[PDB]
């Protein structure tokens, strides 16, 4: 009887704090206890709404850490609908609840590569940020803004938001996962700016923390990143072992949503340097993975490889693919790919096409400017 809308609200906030700490077991426990008490009151909607919002967030974490859903034939995910339930009742909520709704909805839209959606939601959250009491929450927000801007190649804003998050995380006890991630963001941005010297340093600190944390997601991701950095430098051969290692980790612990990207870079590399047989072997594995993970976008990108190397070169298909990426705001991938294509046409005889594609790159940078 001690329990009251206020009693459970505090329990929910405690629950949230463990989520942010990536500590799966404590969260699970609190969630279960809390569900029971909720069932008991039956009384109040908003408290239930808060719970739903947290559960949504909780699931985002599980999906990230031990995402894999070796698929029970059909119970899933709570993510798709939970998104639905909350969406259904979004008018009901104000204050801190409005913040969480937008913030977490932003987070979801972000991992669907709906960068446009993600950023609007975030701006909306940002407005309600005055309702946020503790400093770690600001940190989470900064971290997410940073991540979103990174995907959009807003280098200055990404980097600066990473700094802000870092400062808050560092002064706190058990946020190594987020600290690790800040390093990743610092590195990936440095990579954008071509500052390879700094990039490496950060990538590495990140990786190192990944090992201390023993979390397969992050290990694979950190390795992938190191390899990405090598590849960026055109030193392809050196990237392979770093990619392969990342793949092994992702496969080992069944991190399916991460697998498509992995296969993709490795695959591109082999073709690139002529080792075709391995190329198809990786290609098939990656195409297959992108279906299983329902990454239609990566699926299209893999098809793009097909489009260019074999059947080389399916111009209409390439053009279509670029239009797709463009219409999906996916300007960074668009830029890289436009470059690959132009170079590829250059080493082959003819420059009509290569010049046109180089011209497309500059266009894309100017355009890439527009956003926020």
């Amino acid at each position: 009887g001690v329990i009251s809308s206020s009693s459970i609200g505090e329990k929910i906030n405690e629950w949230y704090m463990y989520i942010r700490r990536f500590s799966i077991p404590d969260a699970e426990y609190l969630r279960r206890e809390i569900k029971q008490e909720l069932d008991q009151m039956e009384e109040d909607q908003d408290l239930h709404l808060y719970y739903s919002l947290m559960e949504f967030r909780h699931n985002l974490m599980l999906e990230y850490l031990e995402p894999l859903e070796k698929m029970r034939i059909e119970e899933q995910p709570r993510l798709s609908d939970l998104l639905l339930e909350i969406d259904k009742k979004q008018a009901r909520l104000t204050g801190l609840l409005e913040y969480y709704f937008n913030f977490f909805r932003g987070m979801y839209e972000l991992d669907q590569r709906e960068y446009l959606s993600a950023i609007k939601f975030f701006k909306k959250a940002e407005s309600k940020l005055i309702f946020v009491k503790d400093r770690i929450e600001k940190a989470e927000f900064f971290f997410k803004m940073s991540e979103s801007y990174y995907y959009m190649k807003q280098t200055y804003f990404s980097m600066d938001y990473a700094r802000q998050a870092y400062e808050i995380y560092k002064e706190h006890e058990a946020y190594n996962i987020r600290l690790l991630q800040c390093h990743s963001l610092f590195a990936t941005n440095f990579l954008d700016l071509k500052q390879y010297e700094d990039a490496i340093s950060h990538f590495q600190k990140a990786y190192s923390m990944a090992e201390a944390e023993k979390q397969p997601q992050l290990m694979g991701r950190t390795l992938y990143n190191i390899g990405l950095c090598k590849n960026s430098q055109s030193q392809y051969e050196d990237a392979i072992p770093y990619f392969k290692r990342a793949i092994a980790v992702f496969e080992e612990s069944n991190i399916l949503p991460s697998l498509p990207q992995a296969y993709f870079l490795i695959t591109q590399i082999h073709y690139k340097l002529g080792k075709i047989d391995k190329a198809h072997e990786y290609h098939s594995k990656g195409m297959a993975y992108s279906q299983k993970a329902g990454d239609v976008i990566y699926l299209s990108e893999f098809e793009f490889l097909k489009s260019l190397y074999l059947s080389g070169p399916d111009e209409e298909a390439i053009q279509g693919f670029f239009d797709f990426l463009e219409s999906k705001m996916l300007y960074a991938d668009l830029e890289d790919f436009a470059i690959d294509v132009a170079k590829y046409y250059h080493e082959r005889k003819n420059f009509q096409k290569a010049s046109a594609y180089f011209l497309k790159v500059e266009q894309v940078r100017q355009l890439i400017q527009g956003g926020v």
Binding site: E147, Y150, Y151, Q181, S184, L185, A187, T188, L191, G220, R221, T222, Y224, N225, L228, S258, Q261, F264, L265, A332, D333, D336
Partner: peptide, 5 residues
């Protein structure tokens, strides 16, 4: 291709 954060 963007990094894996």
């Amino acid at each position: 291709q963007r990094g894996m954060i």
